[PDB]
Design a binder for this molecule. Sequence first.
Ligand SMILES: *[C@@H]1O[C@H](CO)[C@@H](O[C@@H]2O[C@H](CO)[C@@H](O[C@@H]3O[C@H](CO[C@H]4O[C@H](CO)[C@@H](O)[C@H](O)[C@@H]4O)[C@@H](O)[C@H](O[C@H]4O[C@H](CO)[C@@H](O)[C@H](O)[C@@H]4O[C@H]4O[C@H](CO)[C@@H](O)[C@H](O)[C@@H]4O)[C@@H]3O)[C@H](O)[C@H]2NC(C)=O)[C@H](O)[C@H]1NC(C)=O
Ligand SMILES: *[C@@H]1O[C@H](CO)[C@@H](O[C@@H]2O[C@H](CO)[C@@H](O[C@@H]3O[C@H](CO[C@H]4O[C@H](CO)[C@@H](O)[C@H](O)[C@@H]4O)[C@@H](O)[C@H](O[C@H]4O[C@H](CO)[C@@H](O)[C@H](O)[C@@H]4O[C@H]4O[C@H](CO)[C@@H](O)[C@H](O)[C@@H]4O)[C@@H]3O)[C@H](O)[C@H]2NC(C)=O)[C@H](O)[C@H]1NC(C)=O
Ligand SMILES: *[C@@H]1O[C@H](CO)[C@@H](O[C@@H]2O[C@H](CO)[C@@H](O[C@@H]3O[C@H](CO[C@H]4O[C@H](CO)[C@@H](O)[C@H](O)[C@@H]4O)[C@@H](O)[C@H](O[C@H]4O[C@H](CO)[C@@H](O)[C@H](O)[C@@H]4O[C@H]4O[C@H](CO)[C@@H](O)[C@H](O)[C@@H]4O)[C@@H]3O)[C@H](O)[C@H]2NC(C)=O)[C@H](O)[C@H]1NC(C)=O
Ligand SMILES: *[C@@H]1O[C@H](CO)[C@@H](O[C@@H]2O[C@H](CO)[C@@H](O)[C@H](O)[C@H]2NC(C)=O)[C@H](O)[C@H]1NC(C)=O
Ligand SMILES: *[C@@H]1O[C@H](CO)[C@@H](O[C@@H]2O[C@H](CO)[C@@H](O)[C@H](O)[C@H]2NC(C)=O)[C@H](O)[C@H]1NC(C)=O
Ligand SMILES: *[C@@H]1O[C@H](CO)[C@@H](O[C@@H]2O[C@H](CO)[C@@H](O)[C@H](O)[C@H]2NC(C)=O)[C@H](O)[C@H]1NC(C)=O
Ligand SMILES: *[C@@H]1O[C@H](CO)[C@@H](O)[C@H](O)[C@H]1NC(C)=O
Ligand SMILES: *[C@@H]1O[C@H](CO)[C@@H](O)[C@H](O)[C@H]1NC(C)=O
Lengths: 123, 123, 123, 450, 450, 450
Amino acid sequence: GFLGAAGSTMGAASMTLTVQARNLLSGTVWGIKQLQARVLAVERYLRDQQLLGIWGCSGKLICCTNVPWNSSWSNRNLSEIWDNMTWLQWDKEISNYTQIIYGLLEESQNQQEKNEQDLLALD
Amino acid sequence: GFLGAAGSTMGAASMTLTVQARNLLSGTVWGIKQLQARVLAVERYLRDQQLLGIWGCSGKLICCTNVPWNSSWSNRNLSEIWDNMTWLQWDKEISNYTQIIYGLLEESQNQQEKNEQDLLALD
Amino acid sequence: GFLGAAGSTMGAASMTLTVQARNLLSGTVWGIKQLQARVLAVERYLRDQQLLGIWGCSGKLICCTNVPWNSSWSNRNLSEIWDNMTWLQWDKEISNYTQIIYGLLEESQNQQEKNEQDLLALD
Amino acid sequence: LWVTVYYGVPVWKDAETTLFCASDAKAYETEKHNVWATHACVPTDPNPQEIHLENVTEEFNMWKNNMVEQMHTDIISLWDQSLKPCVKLTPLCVTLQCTNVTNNITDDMRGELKNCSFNMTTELRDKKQKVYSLFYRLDVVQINSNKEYRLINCNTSAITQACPKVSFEPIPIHYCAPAGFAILKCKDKKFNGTGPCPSVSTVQCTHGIKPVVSTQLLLNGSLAEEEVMIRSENITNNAKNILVQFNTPVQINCTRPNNNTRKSIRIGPGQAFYATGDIIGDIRQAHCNVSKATWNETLGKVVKQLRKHFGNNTIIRFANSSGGDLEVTTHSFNCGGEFFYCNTSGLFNSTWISNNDSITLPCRIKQIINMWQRIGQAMYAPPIQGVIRCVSNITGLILTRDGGSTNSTTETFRPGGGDMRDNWRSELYKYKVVKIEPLGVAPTRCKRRV
Amino acid sequence: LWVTVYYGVPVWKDAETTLFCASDAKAYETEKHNVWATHACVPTDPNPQEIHLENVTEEFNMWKNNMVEQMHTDIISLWDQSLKPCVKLTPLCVTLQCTNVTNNITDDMRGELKNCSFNMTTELRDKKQKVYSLFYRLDVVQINSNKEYRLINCNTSAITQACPKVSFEPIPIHYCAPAGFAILKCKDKKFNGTGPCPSVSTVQCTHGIKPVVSTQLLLNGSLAEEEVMIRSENITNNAKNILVQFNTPVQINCTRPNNNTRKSIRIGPGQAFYATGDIIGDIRQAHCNVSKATWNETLGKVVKQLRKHFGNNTIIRFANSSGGDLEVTTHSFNCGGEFFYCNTSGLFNSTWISNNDSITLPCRIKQIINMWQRIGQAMYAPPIQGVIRCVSNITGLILTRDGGSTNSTTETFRPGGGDMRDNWRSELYKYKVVKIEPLGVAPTRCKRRV
Amino acid sequence: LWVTVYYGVPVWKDAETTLFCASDAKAYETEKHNVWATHACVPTDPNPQEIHLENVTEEFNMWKNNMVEQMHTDIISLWDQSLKPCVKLTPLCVTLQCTNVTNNITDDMRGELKNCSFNMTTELRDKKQKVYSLFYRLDVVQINSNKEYRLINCNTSAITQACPKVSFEPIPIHYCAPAGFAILKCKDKKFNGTGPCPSVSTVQCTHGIKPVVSTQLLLNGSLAEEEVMIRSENITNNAKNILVQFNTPVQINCTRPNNNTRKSIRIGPGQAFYATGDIIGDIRQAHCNVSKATWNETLGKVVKQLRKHFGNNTIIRFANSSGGDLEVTTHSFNCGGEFFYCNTSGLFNSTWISNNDSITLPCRIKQIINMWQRIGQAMYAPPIQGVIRCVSNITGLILTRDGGSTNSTTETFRPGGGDMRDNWRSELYKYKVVKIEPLGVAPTRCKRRV
Ligand SMILES: *[C@@H]1O[C@H](CO)[C@@H](O[C@@H]2O[C@H](CO)[C@@H](O[C@@H]3O[C@H](CO[C@H]4O[C@H](CO)[C@@H](O)[C@H](O)[C@@H]4O)[C@@H](O)[C@H](O[C@H]4O[C@H](CO)[C@@H](O)[C@H](O)[C@@H]4O[C@H]4O[C@H](CO)[C@@H](O)[C@H](O)[C@@H]4O)[C@@H]3O)[C@H](O)[C@H]2NC(C)=O)[C@H](O)[C@H]1NC(C)=O
Ligand SMILES: *[C@@H]1O[C@H](CO)[C@@H](O[C@@H]2O[C@H](CO)[C@@H](O[C@@H]3O[C@H](CO[C@H]4O[C@H](CO)[C@@H](O)[C@H](O)[C@@H]4O)[C@@H](O)[C@H](O[C@H]4O[C@H](CO)[C@@H](O)[C@H](O)[C@@H]4O[C@H]4O[C@H](CO)[C@@H](O)[C@H](O)[C@@H]4O)[C@@H]3O)[C@H](O)[C@H]2NC(C)=O)[C@H](O)[C@H]1NC(C)=O
Ligand SMILES: *[C@@H]1O[C@H](CO)[C@@H](O[C@@H]2O[C@H](CO)[C@@H](O[C@@H]3O[C@H](CO[C@H]4O[C@H](CO)[C@@H](O)[C@H](O)[C@@H]4O)[C@@H](O)[C@H](O[C@H]4O[C@H](CO)[C@@H](O)[C@H](O)[C@@H]4O[C@H]4O[C@H](CO)[C@@H](O)[C@H](O)[C@@H]4O)[C@@H]3O)[C@H](O)[C@H]2NC(C)=O)[C@H](O)[C@H]1NC(C)=O
Ligand SMILES: *[C@@H]1O[C@H](CO)[C@@H](O[C@@H]2O[C@H](CO)[C@@H](O)[C@H](O)[C@H]2NC(C)=O)[C@H](O)[C@H]1NC(C)=O
Ligand SMILES: *[C@@H]1O[C@H](CO)[C@@H](O[C@@H]2O[C@H](CO)[C@@H](O)[C@H](O)[C@H]2NC(C)=O)[C@H](O)[C@H]1NC(C)=O
Ligand SMILES: *[C@@H]1O[C@H](CO)[C@@H](O[C@@H]2O[C@H](CO)[C@@H](O)[C@H](O)[C@H]2NC(C)=O)[C@H](O)[C@H]1NC(C)=O
Ligand SMILES: *[C@@H]1O[C@H](CO)[C@@H](O)[C@H](O)[C@H]1NC(C)=O
Ligand SMILES: *[C@@H]1O[C@H](CO)[C@@H](O)[C@H](O)[C@H]1NC(C)=O
């Protein structure tokens, strides 16, 4: 269900990716209460949708990138993350590099990628 | 024009796909009247955009899927649908399976698909 | 920065494509002042996002098309545009054909394209 | 076969939603400090699109059309919100020292006015103001030395004056659907307002509808094409209203044949009450004229149509109102900002089996009114000096039918109304709101890749 | 390894946001012209989802939960916006010619009412109205020939009457998070409201919470599971309130044993003041009953729990209020639209070392109140004729502890409260709002193409 | 070549839109129950970004800049919405029994105050209150036994008092564009406000602008860089205002050399009128000081600049106001919550061909004002006891030019103003709003696939 795998491992929590993006939308004062909330609800959806878009993905759920993992980012092995760890605990670590990693995606990639495609599309 | 082929056949109504998605956006009380309406107008756009996204399409207009057609879904032949029928009359039939078919798209496909791509992308 | 290359050449201004789409979102009366503004802010984002979508792109930044350039559109050579000109000065020219060119993208292409793909996907 | 999703498919279904309004570019230019409501609305489309939906049949129900209800609630709110920053007359409830019109020679309509002198507040909380005004009988009621009087609302509600800046003058209003929604418009000539339409269109906005508030007679509305048309919720239910739409308009000429005086009485600070000064002219009861021959041509055409519902050769009777509140026993409407109440006995008094000057209605003017059966906001309309004349098109009727049947033998019809929702229906009958759902999923021989 | 973005990951963190309300389908059907607020809210979910978050532990803090604050501000606004279109009693500040109850035989509660005759405005600004009403001592204050009196708010604020249409009757209200946000719900049986929860769930809406306004005793709330539970912000801080939640409910039976009269006094135009007519019955002080044995079972269970915090074998003392505003020195609540103020000395007067009829509280009724420490909107509740009785469940307490320690020797407890925020906390303790951020980025052996 | 769409291209064009405000973090901490408006605004950006637009030239027009209009309408609304929950003084229109200042020795400014005794309402609708206050001549007007007086607004509008909680004290306000829009900022040192800017920037917010309301002299504004700068809509149109911006600020020292008394008069229930008690001090006309030498240095620099527009060697004359409403014939402003009206004859009285103590302005204080040419909301500012002193920077002027030419011979200048829109322009001159359109389509040798 909603936040079903929230406590499961990150590799297991990859199954509930469909549930989180699904319920992320849901379709005289005291009526404006819900208005201003559901306005922000849209804005929160589009923030991530734009980030997802301006990066190497723009398709939802999963995408890969050409950014190499900086191993000072608190490195653990592939079995020490997906099958040893939960996403919330994971967000409790890379929180510092979150703003840092995001930048490498939008500029260092898609601006590089789609311009790399410009000079190779001319023929 | 707007709802031009609404009365034509489903195969013919596939031509007016461009007109429907186009005009689907259009760009002190009594001003909030239009506000709350045009807020919902956005929300209605994003509901379908998200469904379209979380399914095997995310590109607009047309997409295919790997879900086989359950022939108890009120089966008719390909000439008995596209060239014999109108979309409204068609929506007057599968209305029951609408909520049912939609589910097979988001979970049984993209969660299956993009995870099927995960283990084949590692090499 | 924001509108950094706004004065540079169109070929140079292609580098700041990432900055413009980024800051295009940013995340009792006198509170509704910001509300109605940020509502329209969403609507302005989705207008272009839909146009971008219904055309041959739907991925952001750059896309190409199968529409041939009508040379009465105020033709200049490829060195007389990208490396000789600024985008604002460029928008000061094709402003007439803007509404005209946009139409060839949504209908004459994607409605043609994705239907051309329909009859070739059946096998 | 495989499921295939299609975006932007022509799918819709009946729905109710919140609409928006349009009112030209011309209705804003009128200004005069926001006449009616048009201050926040957006412009009407110069080139409104009406698109015929080829080979489309759709069911409509004019009696269960939420557009009607939305308009009703809007105009209520509009009235409510336009009278609030205006002058508030609550101190105007004061013992009224009042006599009959002094008259002269001789007697025709006697007590239509009073001379009412009252102690009133000035700008200041100290010294009173002993001054007077003119008032109609419908405005003022006696309660028991000369006779003693008070305002007719004083035991009912709260009075506050229409601001002289704004103006009650219908303008055309279009109602429009937001994105994702559409208005369907039935174009068949003969249509009773309920059932399947063969020529259906979609529009962004309705036609321009003047929110004309009136009873018994529908004024300045749309006429039915080629033939007078009858619309009713249940023809055998004597409790249900019957709406009539004409083919040919009937001119109606009304006048207030009294030049008047605007006497500004200062009940400050800042609040200015406009009193009725005197009468410049002979003392004349207003009246409305209809062409007898024209009215008779209309009645001939209306009766024949009614027999198709009530059966082939029956007696059709027209009679006056059965009783009830003043709002429903007269033809009420407004002219030059003034409220007319007209006796329609001369209009509804005829018997038609299957096989020429002026009709004058003895109208009466009331100044204090509270429509829409609201109790607790009273409104006062200040006198508009000068000769008041207006000319309108009678374009429809609101009628009722007697219940004592006579069920296959004869039918009797009387003017009726009172529920203003019926007025809106007569214009909105051809419209309904639907929501769009651009998704649809369909089988075909296409499948996606691995 | 390469960075990989994942959309819709179960990530959240504490956040404060604007919530929305739900109130069944049944709470709208009640109608009576919008009882409480439910006019704009959306419906409660028929099948609310509560999802256990497997293997999830989350920290909660009931004392720093913005849901509590939002509810508080909402009900303030609600009260504020529901009394504005209603009758405004500002002219009711008038010299009150007032005597004691005439009484008869003999003396029990004497001055609980007055007979107050006052000059008052009619519909009109001319002739006065010399008429009277009944008023409680808590309503009216003397200021210095018979004694002279005035309303107790007249030097404080502005009076305006509760509209007889609406009704102060708590209904269950659910609070819900918008999209992108979620409510987490702690399900551990023994939970003090602050710390890590082992059984956490997520819900769209809270349970239905009746916004019962009361002091000293919590009524009709949720009870703690298996055992009486104690919640306090700082047990060693004598300035901090202590919230108690019971396991077993205690029935409380209250009555206003006086049939009354609704005497409608017209202070127009349109404004109708409902006066208190007379007493039909014997003149009886209201009262609330609790079962002595039941109350005693409760006190036995409450004391034992307190010793776990204050240590093993110490004396626990219950005593009455220390003083302060009337709102905090009595148990205040409402019944049948009427405001009760009850002496709780009989409830809080016992000493418990470590090892049967009715309790009657001498309540008093006030009609003029201004809660939430607001100064400048006064409210008047009109009399509700008839026998007024109510039965509630005492489900919790708001207590304070003396500061003169006696720190390891004995403890003394007194009823307290006054900050209504503490009432909301007792139901919302198990909820907190968090925001969702469906992005997350992770290393793996996948890289994209050229 | 083939069409290629590019998203996020640096395209913009002039547009008008709805802006939002920012006001630091410090302007909220001020509190005092929401001083000015800052209660709903968002915080200013700590690190505002101003980005130079390299090699960009843009046309600006400070006279047709909708930012100015939006600010104007906002501050109007602000004033309107901040005086509504406050005390309403409508009963204060009462016959005023009023004498001159008794004076003593001898005569300097005589009738600047009155002693006004009036019958007033208490908390109650019965017994009056015979009490008094002090009032300025500008506040009160006579109408024809000692002389009889009334408030100057009583025939104009409705009075209601500024709530003593809030405070009219400009704070810096930034104006900001929402997403999809941007503010362009011209940075050229010499710029008249209309034409092409060579150093253009984009910002999220304007600089912090104090909404200082004043006439004739601009106070605490921005100064022009290196040189005094002149800005006018049409230099040859004698009907157009001329805005002057200084390079060097001029200190202005004002004082109300009277200790005062706040006498709280209760006009209840709940409404408390603050009367003016008495004078503690000698009876002294307020005054504003400017340094003669400093003022003279300024005038020297201002005149030379004017000759570049009016031609090389002409006579420049400064003279006092030509007449008109009090708002434009004095330098008006506020200090310590009090409204000063200052005679500027001593400031504008000089003749400058091409080749030291204090200036004292005989100010007058009015308490009742209604700015923005609004008729129907009056406002009363209560006395602020104590010595009132303030010091401001004169940073600009609003001037007019005589039409009787003398067209190439000489020019005469007088202080002017009255349209407060001109005040906002002097700060906003370097800003304009534009909308962004991230689409653009361009030819290249790239085409897509089949
Ligand atoms: C069904 O439809 C018909 C026609 O569509 C409609 O008839 C109209 O009646 C209204 C009155 O109810 C008329 O409106 C008034 O007309 C007079 C006369 O207008 C003449 O001049 C204009 C040129 O301006 C000509 O085009 C026209 O043909 C006439 O020769 C005007 O004087 C009235 O103006 C006043 O009212 C306005 C709106 O209320 C105000 O904005 C305006 O300021 C005026 O108010 C003030 O005027 C004075 C200041 O000078 C002041 O002293 C007064 O005290 C007052 O406060 C008004 O426009 C309208 O013209 C008629 N239509 C036509 C085509 O002539 C029926 O009424 C309608 N049926 C129903 C039931 O409504
Ligand atoms: C803790 O929780 C308990 C129970 O959950 C609660 O007890 C409830 O007390 C309230 C009073 O405060 C009761 O509400 C009133 O009940 C009487 C009697 O109801 C009988 O009839 C119904 C059938 O309709 C039976 O189901 C029921 O069991 C009883 O036998 C009603 O007469 C009252 O109606 C009036 O108030 C309504 C709301 O305020 C109005 O909508 C309604 O129109 C009535 O108002 C008017 O009525 C007359 C018109 O006929 C008019 O003349 C009057 O002047 C008046 O203006 C009201 O519903 C409620 O029933 C009790 N609960 C139960 C289960 O019986 C405790 O109060 C609560 N604790 C606290 C502190 O609140
Ligand atoms: C152009 O710009 C200049 C400077 O930028 C500006 O000068 C300022 O004038 C205003 C008055 O209009 C001054 O504001 C008042 O200042 C006094 C004195 O402040 C002293 O103390 C502070 C420490 O707190 C020192 O930092 C400062 O330097 C002074 O030594 C204050 O006493 C005033 O407080 C009252 O007003 C506040 C806002 O209105 C209220 O929030 C506050 O509660 C006070 O109100 C009440 O106070 C009493 C309660 O104790 C009560 O009894 C009173 O009746 C009253 O109701 C106020 O802050 C400001 O300080 C000056 N600026 C500087 C730097 O000193 C010019 O005015 C400006 N030009 C124009 C035209 O505006
Ligand atoms: C409405 O009809 C009445 C009656 O037909 C008209 O009254 C006439 O008025 C004129 C002059 O005012 C008199 O000379 C006639 O004697 C009246 N009666 C008749 C029968 O003509 C009235 O003028 C008409 N009003 C309008 C506006 O046409
Ligand atoms: C609450 O308790 C009091 C006291 O126990 C009850 O008062 C009794 O009332 C009856 C009839 O009204 C009398 O006959 C008794 O003498 C009273 N006292 C006792 C001790 O019974 C009162 O009735 C109770 N109220 C309710 C609603 O139960
Ligand atoms: C503003 O200027 C006037 C006049 O220059 C000053 O008035 C002086 O006040 C002092 C004491 O108040 C007297 O001793 C002087 O005789 C006055 N006149 C002169 C010429 O000095 C006034 O003090 C100044 N105000 C401020 C705040 O500086
Ligand atoms: C609780 O109160 C005590 C003193 O009563 C104080 O020392 C302590 O810091 C407070 N907070 C705690 C214990 O978290
Ligand atoms: C300025 O005013 C002059 C006359 O004073 C007029 O001729 C001219 O058109 C106006 N506008 C300009 C110069 O732009």
